[PDB]
Amino acid sequence: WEEPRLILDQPAQHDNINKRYEIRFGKIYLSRPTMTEADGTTHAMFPQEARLRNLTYSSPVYLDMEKSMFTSIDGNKVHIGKVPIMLRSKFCSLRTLDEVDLYKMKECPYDMGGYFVINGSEKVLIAQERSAANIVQVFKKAAPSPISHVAEIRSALEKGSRLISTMQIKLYGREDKGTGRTIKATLPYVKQDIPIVIVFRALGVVPDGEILQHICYDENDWQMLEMLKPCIEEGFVIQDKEVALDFIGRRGSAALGIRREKRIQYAKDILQKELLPHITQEEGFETRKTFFLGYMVNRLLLCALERKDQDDRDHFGKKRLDLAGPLLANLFRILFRKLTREIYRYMQRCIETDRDFNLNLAVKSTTITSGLKYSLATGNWGEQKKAMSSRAGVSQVLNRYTYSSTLSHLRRTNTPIGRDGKLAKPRQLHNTHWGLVCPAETPEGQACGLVKNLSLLSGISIGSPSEPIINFLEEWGMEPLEDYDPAQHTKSTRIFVNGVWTGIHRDPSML
């Protein structure tokens, strides 16, 4: 449903008629795994036969199509592919069938499943770990660089939970070098770093009093005000939304010829989208983006003032793990986009001749099926033609040398930090690892440390909807940012949900 429509147009002239071809996606239907023998016979699958015959324990996927047409002058179940089904999962045959029949089915009651089967091999997915998204982190740079403190953040949608884009602020210059401490923010789809006040004005707050209201919340802390003053001075060349936006889009990484008319619109788009998308992507909410930018810059300078230790990257509380779910999600998304593009291209090349497409020769189930099979079989995580620059070794053969090894192999983790440049921070055991990952277990050699095994009582969050949290908070005096004032609200308590500020509360203890 992420791409819930394909739309074509045809203002046919020879007699101007506007014909719009549409494809509407519908429900998905899933079946228990089955064989289609070359003899044409079919029957329910059971894993043992697969292990014996070098098969793939997979279930076909059926998607509901819909062909609707719009003409003006002025769909059924389709087999799209077979997804491998993890043993003992809800969709595996063996989740049922008692204990006795397992023996008939040639299955050890001890085996806990949790792995896929391909071409007779038993492949398992090793959980990868990545830095949490939608969080600010401040990092000090090295001595030989005008960059001193950087407060980066990566934005990813709550829905899907897929990486969207990032944005960085670079505390340029040194102490008593380059006049003041110039600050410039890097924006998506731009060809140069930009002064902060410029983007502030472009975002809606043209006057500097509002800017200093949002970024600062301790007036007596004169030092931060005066050391951010240099940025204020250099942004006086811009005084209204329009010139700021045009200045922004002028380096909008587009071609030459958009000129000012569409340049400000391009800037308005790139500020409505692609920037802090995890907050929102539509118009009428740049107040929230302003508030977030102010908070983030405030924190960045606080770390620049040494009033708080620079953020720890190894803090495990900021780490996130991705089990089979999210990973298969990403791979399926890529393959689904490929399939949709194929269907669209076939639509184009088959309606020019004006033939009612069968919807069947158009859909090549080999796309998703082949892609998933290859990705699990080889581990080169991605499209086959892009083997290079593709995360390798995500899926591994299930090592069945001894039952304990099998157990351990399943609760494995990993860090894709590469081995180019030795370093030590990622490898060393960290205090936050207490009771989440084993302290004693780890490989030897170059991988020492980068491979971690879940503690005996570990549990991974699968994600829950946040809406009820919002509903509850509002009941309990959650104050939206719109009613926020520095001098008044210098004692209230900010609230973040899933890494995004949502409002204010002045008595959070009872909350």
Partner RNA sequence: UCGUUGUUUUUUUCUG
For the record, the structure tokens of 47 come out as: 């894993």
The letter for the amino acid at 340 is T
Binding mask 48-87 for another protein (x = CB under 8 A): ----------------------------------------
DSSP for 136-199 reads EEEEE--SSSS--EEEEEEEE-TTTT-EEEEEEEEE-S-TTSSSS--EEEE-TT-SS-EEHHHH
- Decide: is 246 part of the binding site for another protein (CB under 8 A): yes
Of these, 27, 159, 385, 491, which contacts another protein (CB under 8 A)? 385
With residues binned 3-state (H G I as helix, E B as strand, rest as coil), the percentages for the chain, rounded to 5, are 30, 20, 50
Q: Which does 489 bind (CB under 5 to 8 A by kind): another protein, RNA, none?
A: none
Q: Which does 12 bind (CB under 5 to 8 A by kind): another protein, RNA, none?
A: another protein
- Decide: is 119 part of the binding site for RNA (CB under 7 A): no
CA distance 139 to 73: 60
- Decide: is 379 part of the binding site for RNA (CB under 7 A): yes
Binding piece for RNA, criterion CB under 7 A, among 187-195, 294-302, 389-397, 456-464: 389-397
CA distance 274 to 280: 9
Of these, 399, 466, 488, 490, which contacts RNA (CB under 7 A)? 399
- Decide: is 28 part of the binding site for another protein (CB under 8 A): no
- Decide: is 251 part of the binding site for another protein (CB under 8 A): yes
Match 């884009």 to its residue by tokens.
165
- Decide: is 447 part of the binding site for RNA (CB under 7 A): yes
C-beta of 448: minimal distance to another protein in Å? Answer: 5
- Decide: is 180 part of the binding site for RNA (CB under 7 A): no
- Decide: is 13 part of the binding site for another protein (CB under 8 A): yes
Q: How distant is the alpha carbon of residue 280 from its chain centre?
A: 15
DSSP for 248-297 reads HHHTSS--S--HHHHHHHHHHHHHHSSSSTTT--SSS-HHHHHHHHHHHH
Q: In this complex, which beta carbon is closest to RNA, that of residue 423 or of residue 447?
A: 447
* Tally of CA atoms within 13 A in the half-sphere of 404 that contains its CB: 2
- Decide: is 262 part of the binding site for another protein (CB under 8 A): no
Binding piece for another protein, criterion CB under 8 A, among 99-107, 294-302, 439-447, 489-497: 439-447
- Decide: is 256 part of the binding site for another protein (CB under 8 A): yes
Residues 419-438 that bind another protein (CB under 8 A): 422, 424, 427-428
- Decide: is 90 part of the binding site for another protein (CB under 8 A): no
Q: How distant is the alpha carbon of residue 125 from its chain centre?
A: 19
For the record, the structure tokens of 175 come out as: 């102490």
Match 């982190």 to its residue by tokens.
137
Total residues interacting with RNA, rule: CB under 7 A = 11
Q: In this complex, which beta carbon is closest to another protein, that of residue 143 or of residue 256?
A: 256
CA distance 8 to 270: 26
Nearest to 373, CA basis, from 50, 58, 126: 58
Binding site for RNA (CB under 7 A): 379, 392-393, 396-397, 399, 443-445, 447, 451
List residues binding another protein (CB under 8 A).
11-14, 16, 195, 234, 237, 246-247, 250-251, 255-257, 259-260, 263, 385-388, 422, 424, 427-428, 444-446, 448-449
